[PDB]
Protein backbone atom coordinates (compact mmCIF):
# COMPACT_ATOMS: atom_id res chain seq x y z
CA UNK A 1 0.00 0.00 0.00
CA UNK A 2 2.89 2.37 0.76
CA UNK A 3 6.19 0.41 0.31
CA UNK A 4 7.71 1.94 3.47
CA UNK A 5 11.15 1.63 1.90
CA UNK A 6 10.51 4.70 -0.24
CA UNK A 7 10.73 6.80 2.94
CA UNK A 8 14.11 5.46 4.15
CA UNK A 9 17.35 7.50 4.09
CA UNK A 10 20.72 5.73 4.35
CA UNK A 11 23.52 6.83 6.69
CA UNK A 12 27.18 5.71 7.01
CA UNK A 13 28.56 4.41 10.30
CA UNK A 14 32.06 5.45 11.42
CA UNK A 15 33.87 3.56 14.17
CA UNK A 16 36.13 5.24 16.76
CA UNK A 17 39.80 5.80 16.02
CA UNK A 18 40.85 2.87 18.25
CA UNK A 19 40.06 0.52 15.33
CA UNK A 20 41.49 0.51 11.81
CA UNK A 21 38.63 0.13 9.31
CA UNK A 22 36.21 2.73 10.66
CA UNK A 23 33.95 2.27 7.64
CA UNK A 24 31.73 -0.41 9.16
CA UNK A 25 28.81 -0.24 6.71
CA UNK A 26 25.43 1.42 6.14
CA UNK A 27 22.13 1.75 8.05
CA UNK A 28 18.68 3.30 7.45
CA UNK A 29 15.81 5.00 9.29
CA UNK A 30 12.54 6.72 8.47
CA UNK A 31 13.46 10.00 6.77
CA UNK A 32 13.73 13.16 8.89
CA UNK A 33 10.53 15.18 8.77
CA UNK A 34 9.37 18.45 10.25
CA UNK A 35 7.61 16.78 13.16
CA UNK A 36 10.37 14.27 14.03
CA UNK A 37 14.04 14.69 13.22
CA UNK A 38 15.87 11.61 11.99
CA UNK A 39 18.86 12.49 14.15
CA UNK A 40 17.32 12.17 17.62
CA UNK A 41 15.53 8.93 16.75
CA UNK A 42 18.72 7.64 15.12
CA UNK A 43 21.13 8.13 18.04
CA UNK A 44 21.48 5.47 20.72
CA UNK A 45 21.54 2.60 18.23
CA UNK A 46 24.01 -0.21 18.90
CA UNK A 47 25.81 -2.20 16.19
CA UNK A 48 27.56 -5.51 16.90
CA UNK A 49 30.46 -5.98 14.51
CA UNK A 50 33.22 -8.57 14.67
CA UNK A 51 36.51 -7.13 15.89
CA UNK A 52 38.34 -8.98 13.08
CA UNK A 53 36.51 -6.74 10.60
CA UNK A 54 37.47 -3.60 12.54
CA UNK A 55 41.14 -4.65 12.44
CA UNK A 56 41.56 -6.65 9.20
CA UNK A 57 43.33 -9.53 10.91
CA UNK A 58 41.32 -12.75 11.20
CA UNK A 59 42.94 -13.36 14.59
CA UNK A 60 40.23 -11.27 16.26
CA UNK A 61 37.37 -13.27 14.72
CA UNK A 62 36.11 -14.59 18.07
CA UNK A 63 35.49 -11.17 19.68
CA UNK A 64 32.55 -8.91 18.85
CA UNK A 65 32.29 -5.19 19.62
CA UNK A 66 29.14 -3.20 20.27
CA UNK A 67 29.40 0.32 18.84
CA UNK A 68 26.89 2.86 20.16
CA UNK A 69 25.91 5.93 18.10
CA UNK A 70 25.32 9.15 20.08
CA UNK A 71 26.05 11.81 17.38
CA UNK A 72 25.13 12.14 13.72
CA UNK A 73 27.11 14.52 11.51
CA UNK A 74 25.05 14.73 8.34
CA UNK A 75 24.81 11.18 6.95
CA UNK A 76 27.67 9.87 9.12
CA UNK A 77 27.14 8.18 12.48
CA UNK A 78 29.84 8.88 15.05
CA UNK A 79 29.89 5.78 17.28
CA UNK A 80 31.66 4.88 20.53
CA UNK A 81 32.64 1.70 22.31
CA UNK A 82 29.58 0.04 23.87
CA UNK A 83 30.73 -3.43 24.89
CA UNK A 84 32.65 -6.66 24.33
CA UNK A 85 31.55 -10.26 24.02
CA UNK A 86 32.86 -13.56 22.69
CA UNK A 87 31.25 -15.55 19.91
CA UNK A 88 29.25 -18.50 21.16
CA UNK A 89 31.18 -21.10 19.17
CA UNK A 90 34.60 -19.84 20.27
CA UNK A 91 33.65 -19.85 23.94
CA UNK A 92 32.14 -23.33 23.56
CA UNK A 93 35.40 -24.55 22.02
CA UNK A 94 37.46 -23.73 25.13
CA UNK A 95 35.31 -25.45 27.78
CA UNK A 96 36.51 -29.03 27.48
CA UNK A 97 36.33 -31.78 30.06
CA UNK A 98 39.22 -33.04 32.20
CA UNK A 99 40.26 -29.47 33.08
CA UNK A 100 39.23 -26.83 35.60
CA UNK A 101 37.45 -23.61 34.60
CA UNK A 102 38.11 -20.45 36.61
CA UNK A 103 36.19 -17.15 36.18
CA UNK A 104 36.10 -13.74 37.86
CA UNK A 105 34.31 -10.44 37.34
CA UNK A 106 34.66 -6.97 38.83
CA UNK A 107 32.80 -3.68 38.49
CA UNK A 108 35.25 -0.80 37.95
CA UNK A 109 35.13 2.73 36.57
CA UNK A 110 37.68 4.21 34.17
CA UNK A 111 39.48 7.54 34.46
CA UNK A 112 36.62 9.28 32.64
CA UNK A 113 34.03 7.68 34.97
CA UNK A 114 32.87 4.86 32.68
CA UNK A 115 31.55 2.08 34.93
CA UNK A 116 32.30 -1.35 33.46
CA UNK A 117 31.95 -4.97 34.48
CA UNK A 118 34.75 -7.08 32.99
CA UNK A 119 34.51 -10.88 32.90
CA UNK A 120 37.73 -12.90 32.89
CA UNK A 121 38.08 -16.59 32.05
CA UNK A 122 40.92 -19.10 32.23
CA UNK A 123 41.51 -22.85 32.11
CA UNK A 124 44.17 -25.08 33.64
CA UNK A 125 47.08 -25.71 31.28
CA UNK A 126 48.39 -29.23 30.71
CA UNK A 127 52.18 -29.42 30.80
CA UNK A 128 54.00 -31.15 27.91
CA UNK A 129 55.33 -34.07 30.01
CA UNK A 130 52.10 -34.66 31.95
CA UNK A 131 50.74 -38.22 31.92
CA UNK A 132 47.64 -38.19 34.14
CA UNK A 133 44.33 -37.69 32.34
CA UNK A 134 43.01 -34.62 34.14
CA UNK A 135 44.48 -31.20 34.97
CA UNK A 136 42.65 -29.97 38.05
CA UNK A 137 43.86 -27.18 40.31
CA UNK A 138 43.04 -27.34 43.99
CA UNK A 139 40.19 -25.07 45.10
CA UNK A 140 42.50 -22.96 47.29
CA UNK A 141 44.68 -22.05 44.28
CA UNK A 142 41.67 -21.11 42.15
CA UNK A 143 40.59 -18.71 44.88
CA UNK A 144 44.02 -17.05 44.65
CA UNK A 145 43.87 -17.03 40.84
CA UNK A 146 40.38 -15.54 40.92
CA UNK A 147 41.59 -12.89 43.37
CA UNK A 148 44.63 -12.11 41.18
CA UNK A 149 42.43 -11.68 38.12
CA UNK A 150 40.28 -9.13 39.94
CA UNK A 151 43.11 -6.88 41.12
CA UNK A 152 44.51 -6.69 37.59
CA UNK A 153 41.21 -5.71 35.99
CA UNK A 154 40.68 -3.15 38.75
CA UNK A 155 44.22 -1.82 38.38
CA UNK A 156 44.39 -1.71 34.56
CA UNK A 157 40.99 0.00 34.16
CA UNK A 158 40.86 2.63 36.91
CA UNK A 159 44.22 4.07 35.86
CA UNK A 160 43.14 4.70 32.26
CA UNK A 161 40.29 6.16 30.20
CA UNK A 162 37.88 4.09 28.10
CA UNK A 163 39.60 4.95 24.81
CA UNK A 164 43.03 3.84 26.03
CA UNK A 165 41.43 0.77 27.57
CA UNK A 166 39.84 -0.06 24.24
CA UNK A 167 43.39 0.04 22.79
CA UNK A 168 44.42 -2.21 25.67
CA UNK A 169 41.83 -4.87 24.82
CA UNK A 170 42.82 -5.51 21.17
CA UNK A 171 46.18 -7.21 21.91
CA UNK A 172 44.83 -8.83 25.12
CA UNK A 173 47.28 -7.05 27.42
CA UNK A 174 45.22 -7.77 30.53
CA UNK A 175 44.68 -11.45 29.75
CA UNK A 176 48.35 -12.11 29.05
CA UNK A 177 49.59 -10.21 32.11
CA UNK A 178 47.15 -12.12 34.32
CA UNK A 179 48.66 -15.29 32.77
CA UNK A 180 52.07 -13.87 33.73
CA UNK A 181 50.88 -13.14 37.27
CA UNK A 182 49.52 -16.66 37.89
CA UNK A 183 52.52 -18.63 36.66
CA UNK A 184 53.73 -19.18 40.24
CA UNK A 185 50.18 -20.04 41.29
CA UNK A 186 49.22 -22.44 38.42
CA UNK A 187 49.98 -22.81 34.69
CA UNK A 188 47.08 -21.28 32.77
CA UNK A 189 45.88 -21.18 29.16
CA UNK A 190 43.37 -19.16 27.16
CA UNK A 191 43.29 -16.36 29.70
CA UNK A 192 40.86 -13.96 28.05
CA UNK A 193 38.84 -10.88 28.78
CA UNK A 194 35.72 -12.58 27.48
CA UNK A 195 33.07 -9.85 27.96
CA UNK A 196 32.84 -6.15 28.81
CA UNK A 197 29.62 -4.39 29.84
CA UNK A 198 29.00 -0.64 30.04
CA UNK A 199 26.83 0.06 33.07
CA UNK A 200 27.07 3.85 33.55
CA UNK A 201 28.33 6.64 31.28
CA UNK A 202 29.64 10.04 32.44
CA UNK A 203 27.80 13.19 31.47
CA UNK A 204 28.14 13.32 27.71
CA UNK A 205 31.08 15.34 26.32
CA UNK A 206 30.79 15.74 22.55
CA UNK A 207 34.24 17.33 22.44
CA UNK A 208 35.84 14.21 23.90
CA UNK A 209 34.06 12.01 21.35
CA UNK A 210 34.92 14.19 18.34
CA UNK A 211 38.57 13.83 19.35
CA UNK A 212 38.01 10.06 19.03
CA UNK A 213 36.92 10.55 15.40
CA UNK A 214 39.76 12.67 13.98
Amino acid sequence: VVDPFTRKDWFDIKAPTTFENRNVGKTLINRSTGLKNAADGLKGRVFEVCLADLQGSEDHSYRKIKLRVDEVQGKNLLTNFHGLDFTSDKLRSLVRKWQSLVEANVTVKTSDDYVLRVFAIAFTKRQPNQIKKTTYAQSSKLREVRKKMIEIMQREVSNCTLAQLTSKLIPEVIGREIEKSTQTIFPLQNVHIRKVKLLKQPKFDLGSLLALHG
Partner: peptide
Protein backbone atom coordinates in the same frame (compact mmCIF):
# COMPACT_ATOMS: atom_id res chain seq x y z
CA UNK B 1 33.11 -12.08 1.27
CA UNK B 2 36.14 -13.25 3.25
CA UNK B 3 39.16 -14.89 1.72
CA UNK B 4 40.13 -17.87 3.85
CA UNK B 5 37.32 -17.75 6.44
CA UNK B 6 36.97 -20.86 8.60
CA UNK B 7 33.39 -22.03 9.16
CA UNK B 8 32.42 -22.15 12.86
CA UNK B 9 31.41 -25.39 14.49
CA UNK B 10 28.18 -26.22 16.34
CA UNK B 11 28.88 -27.25 19.93
Amino acid sequence: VYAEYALPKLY
